[PDB]
Amino acid sequence: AEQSDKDVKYYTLEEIQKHKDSKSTWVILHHKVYDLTKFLEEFPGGEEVLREQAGGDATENFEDVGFSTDARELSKKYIIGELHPDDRSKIAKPSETL
């Protein structure tokens, strides 16, 4: 879903589900989406620790893999838009059998 209004982009969790590269790495707090693509470069080679949780969690994850103080304010700093209201319900938890 590409938002016609170019302010606060509606990313879909279906979009981020294919988190293969660092540039495809975004995380969701619950209903709003935050950029992890840049945030992982703050960790020297620390893309792989958070990649698996990208397209899934950020409620605990963004602060977990994040810096102890910095990640707490850097959550709202990396405001890349909001996660699609339908998609946070779709992939609240996917089939864990894969």
Residue 13: CATH number of its domain = 3.10.120.10
Distance from C-alpha of 37 to C-alpha of 43, rounded to nearest angstrom:
11
Residues whose CB falls within 8 Å of the CB of residue 92, separated by 6 or more in sequence, listed in order: none
Q: What total number of domains does the chain contain? A: 1
Q: Which of 61, 32, 34 is nearest to 49 (CA)?
A: 61
Method of structure determination: NMR
Range of the domain at 28: 1-98
Contact between 84 and 1 (Cβ < 8 Å): yes
